Short mmCIF file of C-alpha atoms in Angstrom, two decimals:
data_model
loop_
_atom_site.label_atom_id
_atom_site.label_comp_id
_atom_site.label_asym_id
_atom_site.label_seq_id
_atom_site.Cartn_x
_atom_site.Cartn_y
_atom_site.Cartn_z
CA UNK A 1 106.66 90.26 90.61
CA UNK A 2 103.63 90.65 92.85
CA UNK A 3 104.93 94.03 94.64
CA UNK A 4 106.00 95.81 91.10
CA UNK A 5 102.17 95.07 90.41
CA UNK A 6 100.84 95.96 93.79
CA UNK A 7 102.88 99.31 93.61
CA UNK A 8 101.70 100.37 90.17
CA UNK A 9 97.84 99.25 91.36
CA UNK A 10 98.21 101.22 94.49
CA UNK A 11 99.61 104.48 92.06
CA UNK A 12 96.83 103.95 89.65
CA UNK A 13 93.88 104.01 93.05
CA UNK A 14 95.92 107.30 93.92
CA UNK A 15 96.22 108.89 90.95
CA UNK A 16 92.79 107.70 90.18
CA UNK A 17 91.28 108.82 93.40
CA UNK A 18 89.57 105.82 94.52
CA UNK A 19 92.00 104.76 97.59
CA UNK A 20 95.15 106.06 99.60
CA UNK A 21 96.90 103.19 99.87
CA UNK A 22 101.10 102.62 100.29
CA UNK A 23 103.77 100.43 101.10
CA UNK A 24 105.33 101.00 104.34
CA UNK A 25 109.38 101.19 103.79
CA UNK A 26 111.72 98.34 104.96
CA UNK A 27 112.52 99.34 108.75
CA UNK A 28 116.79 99.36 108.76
CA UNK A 29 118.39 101.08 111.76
CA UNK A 30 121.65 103.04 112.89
CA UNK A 31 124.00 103.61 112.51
CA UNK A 32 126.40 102.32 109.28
CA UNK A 33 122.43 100.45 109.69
CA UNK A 34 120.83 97.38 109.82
CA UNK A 35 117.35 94.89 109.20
CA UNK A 36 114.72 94.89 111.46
CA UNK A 37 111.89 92.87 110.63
CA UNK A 38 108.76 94.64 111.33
CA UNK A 39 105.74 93.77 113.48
CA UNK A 40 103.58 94.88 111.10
CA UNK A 41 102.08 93.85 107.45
CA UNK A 42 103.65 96.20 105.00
CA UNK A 43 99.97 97.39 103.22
CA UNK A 44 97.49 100.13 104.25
CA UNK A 45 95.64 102.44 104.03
CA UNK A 46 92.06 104.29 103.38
CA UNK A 47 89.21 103.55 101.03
CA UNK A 48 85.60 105.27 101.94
CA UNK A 49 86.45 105.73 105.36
CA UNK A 50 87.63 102.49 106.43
CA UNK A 51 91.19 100.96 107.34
CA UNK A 52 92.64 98.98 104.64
CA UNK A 53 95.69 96.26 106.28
CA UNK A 54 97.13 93.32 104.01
CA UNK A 55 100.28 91.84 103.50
CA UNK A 56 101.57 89.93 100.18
CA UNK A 57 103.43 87.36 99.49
CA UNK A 58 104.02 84.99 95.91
CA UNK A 59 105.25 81.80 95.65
CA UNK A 60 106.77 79.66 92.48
CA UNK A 61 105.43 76.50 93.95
CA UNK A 62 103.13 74.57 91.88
CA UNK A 63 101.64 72.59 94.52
CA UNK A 64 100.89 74.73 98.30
CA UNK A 65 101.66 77.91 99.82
CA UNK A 66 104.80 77.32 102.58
CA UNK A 67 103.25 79.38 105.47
CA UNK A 68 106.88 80.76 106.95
CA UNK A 69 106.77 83.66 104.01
CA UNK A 70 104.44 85.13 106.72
CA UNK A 71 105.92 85.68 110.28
CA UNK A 72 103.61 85.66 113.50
CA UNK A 73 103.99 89.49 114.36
CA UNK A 74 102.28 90.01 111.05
CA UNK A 75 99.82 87.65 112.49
CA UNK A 76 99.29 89.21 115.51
CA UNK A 77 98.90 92.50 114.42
CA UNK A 78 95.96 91.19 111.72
CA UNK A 79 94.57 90.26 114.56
CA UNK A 80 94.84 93.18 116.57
CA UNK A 81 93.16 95.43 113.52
CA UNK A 82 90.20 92.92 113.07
CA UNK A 83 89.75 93.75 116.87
CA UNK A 84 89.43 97.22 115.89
CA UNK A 85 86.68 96.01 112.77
CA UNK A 86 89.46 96.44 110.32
CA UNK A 87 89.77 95.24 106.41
CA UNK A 88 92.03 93.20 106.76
CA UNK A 89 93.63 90.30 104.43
CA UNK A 90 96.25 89.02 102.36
CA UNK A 91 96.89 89.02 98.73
CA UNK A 92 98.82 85.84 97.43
CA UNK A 93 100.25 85.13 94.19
CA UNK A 94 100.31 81.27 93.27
CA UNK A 95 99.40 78.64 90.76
CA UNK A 96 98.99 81.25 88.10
CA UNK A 97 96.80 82.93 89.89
CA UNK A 98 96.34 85.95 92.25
CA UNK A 99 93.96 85.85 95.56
CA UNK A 100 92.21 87.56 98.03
CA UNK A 101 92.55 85.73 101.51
CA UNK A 102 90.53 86.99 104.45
CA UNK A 103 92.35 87.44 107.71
CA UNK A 104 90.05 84.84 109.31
CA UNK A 105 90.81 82.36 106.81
CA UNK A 106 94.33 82.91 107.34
CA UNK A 107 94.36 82.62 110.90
CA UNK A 108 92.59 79.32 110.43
CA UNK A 109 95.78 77.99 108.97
CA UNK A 110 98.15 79.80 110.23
CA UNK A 111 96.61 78.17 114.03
CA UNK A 112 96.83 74.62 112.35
CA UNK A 113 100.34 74.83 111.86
CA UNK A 114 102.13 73.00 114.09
CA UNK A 115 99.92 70.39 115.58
CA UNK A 116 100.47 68.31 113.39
CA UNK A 117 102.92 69.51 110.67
CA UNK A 118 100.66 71.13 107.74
CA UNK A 119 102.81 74.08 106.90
CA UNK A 120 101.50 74.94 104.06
CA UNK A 121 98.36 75.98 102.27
CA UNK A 122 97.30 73.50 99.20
CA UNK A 123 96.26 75.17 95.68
CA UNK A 124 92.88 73.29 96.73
CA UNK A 125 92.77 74.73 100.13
CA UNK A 126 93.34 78.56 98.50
CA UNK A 127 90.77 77.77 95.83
CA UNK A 128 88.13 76.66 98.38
CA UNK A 129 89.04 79.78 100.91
CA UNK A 130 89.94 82.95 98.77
CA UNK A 131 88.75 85.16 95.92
CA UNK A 132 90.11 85.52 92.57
CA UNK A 133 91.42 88.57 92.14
CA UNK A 134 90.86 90.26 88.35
CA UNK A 135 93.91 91.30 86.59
CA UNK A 136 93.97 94.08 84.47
CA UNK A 137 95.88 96.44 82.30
CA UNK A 138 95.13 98.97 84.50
CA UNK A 139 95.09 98.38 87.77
CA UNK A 140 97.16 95.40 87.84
CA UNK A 141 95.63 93.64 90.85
CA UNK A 142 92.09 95.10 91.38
CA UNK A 143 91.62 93.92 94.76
CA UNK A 144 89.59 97.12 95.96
CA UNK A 145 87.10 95.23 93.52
CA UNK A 146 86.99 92.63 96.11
CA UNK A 147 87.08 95.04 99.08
CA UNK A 148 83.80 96.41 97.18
CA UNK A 149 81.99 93.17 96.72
CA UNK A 150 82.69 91.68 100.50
CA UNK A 151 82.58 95.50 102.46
CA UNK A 152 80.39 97.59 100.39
CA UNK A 153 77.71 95.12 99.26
CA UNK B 1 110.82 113.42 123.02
CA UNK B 2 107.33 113.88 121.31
CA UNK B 3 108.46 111.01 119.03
CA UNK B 4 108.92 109.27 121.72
CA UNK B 5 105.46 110.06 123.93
CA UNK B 6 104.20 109.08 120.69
CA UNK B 7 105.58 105.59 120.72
CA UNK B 8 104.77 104.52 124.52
CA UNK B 9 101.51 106.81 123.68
CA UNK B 10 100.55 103.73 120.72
CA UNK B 11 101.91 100.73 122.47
CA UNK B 12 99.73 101.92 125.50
CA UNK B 13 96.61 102.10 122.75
CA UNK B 14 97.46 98.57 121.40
CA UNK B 15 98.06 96.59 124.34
CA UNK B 16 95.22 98.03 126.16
CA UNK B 17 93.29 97.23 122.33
CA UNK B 18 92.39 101.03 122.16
CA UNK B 19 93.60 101.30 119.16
CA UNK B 20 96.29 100.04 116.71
CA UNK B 21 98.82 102.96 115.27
CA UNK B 22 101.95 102.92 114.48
CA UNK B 23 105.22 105.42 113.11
CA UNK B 24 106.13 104.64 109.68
CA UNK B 25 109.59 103.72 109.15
CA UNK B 26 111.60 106.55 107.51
CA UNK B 27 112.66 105.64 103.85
CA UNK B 28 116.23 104.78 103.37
CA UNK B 29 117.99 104.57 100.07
CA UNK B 30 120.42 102.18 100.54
CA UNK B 31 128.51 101.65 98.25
CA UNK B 32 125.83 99.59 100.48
CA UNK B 33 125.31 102.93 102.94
CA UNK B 34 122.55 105.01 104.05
CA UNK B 35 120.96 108.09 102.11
CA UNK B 36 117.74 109.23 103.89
CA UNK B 37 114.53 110.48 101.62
CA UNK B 38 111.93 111.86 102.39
CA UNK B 39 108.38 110.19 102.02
CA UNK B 40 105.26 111.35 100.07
CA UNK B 41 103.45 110.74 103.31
CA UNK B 42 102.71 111.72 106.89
CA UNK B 43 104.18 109.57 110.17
CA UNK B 44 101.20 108.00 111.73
CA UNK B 45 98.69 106.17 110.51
CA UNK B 46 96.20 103.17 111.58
CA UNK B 47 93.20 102.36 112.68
CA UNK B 48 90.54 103.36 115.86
CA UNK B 49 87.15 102.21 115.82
CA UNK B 50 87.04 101.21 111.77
CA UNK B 51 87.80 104.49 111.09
CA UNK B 52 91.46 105.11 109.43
CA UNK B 53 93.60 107.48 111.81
CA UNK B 54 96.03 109.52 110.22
CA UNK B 55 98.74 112.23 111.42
CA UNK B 56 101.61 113.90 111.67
CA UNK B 57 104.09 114.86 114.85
CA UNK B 58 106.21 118.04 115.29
CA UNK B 59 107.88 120.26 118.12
CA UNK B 60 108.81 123.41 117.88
CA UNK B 61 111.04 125.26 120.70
CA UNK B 62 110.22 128.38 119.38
CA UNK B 63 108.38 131.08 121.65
CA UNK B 64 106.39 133.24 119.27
CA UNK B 65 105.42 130.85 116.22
CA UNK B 66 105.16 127.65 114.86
CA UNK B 67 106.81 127.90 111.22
CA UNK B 68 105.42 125.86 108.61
CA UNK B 69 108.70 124.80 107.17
CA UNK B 70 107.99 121.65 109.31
CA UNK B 71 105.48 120.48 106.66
CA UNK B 72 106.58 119.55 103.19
CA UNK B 73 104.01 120.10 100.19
CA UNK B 74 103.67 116.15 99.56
CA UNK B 75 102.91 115.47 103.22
CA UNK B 76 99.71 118.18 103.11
CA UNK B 77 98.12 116.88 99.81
CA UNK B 78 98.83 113.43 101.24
CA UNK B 79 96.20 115.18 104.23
CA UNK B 80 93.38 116.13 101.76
CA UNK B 81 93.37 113.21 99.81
CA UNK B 82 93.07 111.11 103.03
CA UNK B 83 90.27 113.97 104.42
CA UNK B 84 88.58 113.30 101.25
CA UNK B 85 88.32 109.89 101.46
CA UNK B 86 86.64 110.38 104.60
CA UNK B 87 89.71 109.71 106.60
CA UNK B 88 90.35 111.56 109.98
CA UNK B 89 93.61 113.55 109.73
CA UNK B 90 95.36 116.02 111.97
CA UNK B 91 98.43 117.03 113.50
CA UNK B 92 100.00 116.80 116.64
CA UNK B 93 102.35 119.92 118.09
CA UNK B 94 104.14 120.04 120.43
CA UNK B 95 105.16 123.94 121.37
CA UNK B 96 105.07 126.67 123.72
CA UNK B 97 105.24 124.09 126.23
CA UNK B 98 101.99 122.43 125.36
CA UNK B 99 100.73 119.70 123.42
CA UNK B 100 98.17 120.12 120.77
CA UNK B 101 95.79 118.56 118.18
CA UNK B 102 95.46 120.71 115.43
CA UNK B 103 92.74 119.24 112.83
CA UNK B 104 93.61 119.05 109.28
CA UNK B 105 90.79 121.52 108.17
CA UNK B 106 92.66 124.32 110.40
CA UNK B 107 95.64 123.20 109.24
CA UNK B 108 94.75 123.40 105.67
CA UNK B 109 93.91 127.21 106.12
CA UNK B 110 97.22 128.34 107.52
CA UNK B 111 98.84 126.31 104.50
CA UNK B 112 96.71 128.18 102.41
CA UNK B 113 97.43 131.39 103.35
CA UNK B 114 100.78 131.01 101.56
CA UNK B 115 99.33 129.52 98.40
CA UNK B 116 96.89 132.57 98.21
CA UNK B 117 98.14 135.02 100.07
CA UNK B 118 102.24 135.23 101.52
CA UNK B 119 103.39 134.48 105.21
CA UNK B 120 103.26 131.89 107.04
CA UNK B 121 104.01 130.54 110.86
CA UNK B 122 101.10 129.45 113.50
CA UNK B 123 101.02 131.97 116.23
CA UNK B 124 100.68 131.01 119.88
CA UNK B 125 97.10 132.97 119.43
CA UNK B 126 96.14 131.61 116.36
CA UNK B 127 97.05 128.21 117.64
CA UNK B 128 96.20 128.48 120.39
CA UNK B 129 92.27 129.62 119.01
CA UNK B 130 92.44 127.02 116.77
CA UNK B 131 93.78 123.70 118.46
CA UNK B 132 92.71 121.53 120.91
CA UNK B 133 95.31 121.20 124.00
CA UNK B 134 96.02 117.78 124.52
CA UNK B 135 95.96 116.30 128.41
CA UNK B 136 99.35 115.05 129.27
CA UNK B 137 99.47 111.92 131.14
CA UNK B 138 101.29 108.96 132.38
CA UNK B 139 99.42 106.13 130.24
CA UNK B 140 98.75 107.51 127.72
CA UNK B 141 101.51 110.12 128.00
CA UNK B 142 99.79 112.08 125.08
CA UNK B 143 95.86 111.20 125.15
CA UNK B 144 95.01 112.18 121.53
CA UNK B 145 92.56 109.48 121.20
CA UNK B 146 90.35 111.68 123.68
CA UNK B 147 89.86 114.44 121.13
CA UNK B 148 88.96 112.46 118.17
CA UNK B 149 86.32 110.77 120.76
CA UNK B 150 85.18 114.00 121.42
CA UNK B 151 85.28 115.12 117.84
CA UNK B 152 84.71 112.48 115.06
CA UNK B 153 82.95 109.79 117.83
CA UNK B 154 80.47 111.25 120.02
CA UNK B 155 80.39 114.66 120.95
#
């Protein structure tokens, strides 16, 4: 489970100093209390003085990435924090793998959609268009490794 | 009510693509029911310029102070470790009917004058001294934006 390893990456960057980075908590309301969905992605924070955004999402799909895990207020508001020159991306866990998708790349697809009906991303299409991600012992999912490379030279 | 400033304050910042922050959702430990926690974090955070924008809201109704019991422990190290990492923190209060951005350095003092010495509260003077008074508006209602222009942006 990709959030079990996101969550004990995100302690270890804490603990370790080298981001502040959380989870924002499922929005319910009142009273009981219900599910709203958000119109946010659930990831940010800080590392070196700049705005870290991303959602996350895994699939058990051996073949593409079915693009309705996302919803388009989590679109929109990637695109509202690139506006702002933002980090901003998703982190998806598929074909044994774990990548790094930049929010561009993402919008690419997620535009694509409907006209005609590719609603999905390929394993192809993700290898040609995001980063590996290097798992670890500890952290998990070293994505700020990739926020490095891309952001920080 | 500040809670509220606050939220038509951020909608006005996004749709006018000022910036984009937003209230965390309070945690809920879900018998199915409701059990509220408290978080290891402050309320507001996002983003303004590529710079991560970080804060917390409170009003006070007293006349004389602003106690300190309105900050838990986890919240203010949650503060320096964002400071450190070159974040720019503050809080917003709302008291002695004013608004006013108090930045995390001054606000790390006055916490620190329990953890070294004994009190504490904010007092309308030392507030007052301390924090910038925010300008009240109808869009924004709360322009907090305009002091960390003034103060982190270009002075």
């Amino acid at each position: 489970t990709l959030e079990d390893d996101l969550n004990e990456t995100n302690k270890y960057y804490l603990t370790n100093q080298i981001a502040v980075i959380h989870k924002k908590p499922t929005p319910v309301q009142i009273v009981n209390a219900y599910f709203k969905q958000s119109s946010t992605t659930d990831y940010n924070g800080i590392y070196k003085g700049r705005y870290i955004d991303f959602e996350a999402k895994e699939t058990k799909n051996k073949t593409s990435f079915p693009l309705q895990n996302f919803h388009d207020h989590q679109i929109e508001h990637m695109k509202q924090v690139k506006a702002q020159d933002g980090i901003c991306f998703v982190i998806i866990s598929a074909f044994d793998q774990v990548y790094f998708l930049e929010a561009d790349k993402l919008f690419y697809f997620w535009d694509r959609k409907e006209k005609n009906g590719r609603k999905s991303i390929r394993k192809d299409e993700l290898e040609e268009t995001a980063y590996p991600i290097s798992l670890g012992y500890a952290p998990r999912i070293d994505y700020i490794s990739i926020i490095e490379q891309l952001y920080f030279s």
